[PDB]
Design a protein around this ligand. Structure first.
Ligand SMILES: Cc1cncc(-c2ccc(N[C@@H]3C[C@H]4CC[C@H](N4)[C@H]3CCC3CCS(=O)(=O)CC3)c3[nH]c(=O)c(C)cc23)c1
Length: 130
């Protein structure tokens, strides 16, 4: 309907704002763009699907997220990837794993405080009717 196009445009607005707020945080710089293959030449082999906050914006714009839940899958992907690709005790790995977890925790916390559950529920129901 028209009532439904609006619902997803509002979602896209919501998600772009949250994503922007993560992307401007200095701790998450490492997650903002796709990996530089010169810096980590084996990344593509170790990680099935790279994900990053730039890509998440592109996906929002491509109407790829119909629910916040689907969005959070990709935030969770950004984080799990980092935990997978940098597992070691060394401080460089610990630092990025911390930041990965902090990204994930921040996203969820913004969403907890700012997403209306009835809005998310409406998004899920319009989605389920397709
Ligand atoms: C500028 C840039 C562009 N593209 C990719 C990266 C990048 C580099 C290194 C790692 N992982 C390292 C694996 C081994 C070797 C050292 C250490 N363990 C680890 C470096 C950790 C470092 C990352 C940059 S920081 O400023 O956040 C401080 C901690 C990378 N690992 C990744 O998972 C990603 C997404 C990129 C990346 C950087």
């Amino acid at each position: 309907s028209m009532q439904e196009e609006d619902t997803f445009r509002e979602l896209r607005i919501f998600l772009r704002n949250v994503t922007h707020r993560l992307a401007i945080d200095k701790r998450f710089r490492v997650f903002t763009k796709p990996v530089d293959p010169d810096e980590v030449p084996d990344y593509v082999t170790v990680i099935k699907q790279p994900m990053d906050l730039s890509s998440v914006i592109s996906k929002i714009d491509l109407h790829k997220y119909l629910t916040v839940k689907d969005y959070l899958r990709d935030i969770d992907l950004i984080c799990s990837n980092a935990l997978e690709y940098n597992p070691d005790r060394d401080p460089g790995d610990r630092l990025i794993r911390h930041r990965a977890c902090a990204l994930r925790d921040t996203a969820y916390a913004i969403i907890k405080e700012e997403l209306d559950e009835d809005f998310e529920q409406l998004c899920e129901e319009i989605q389920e009717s397709r």
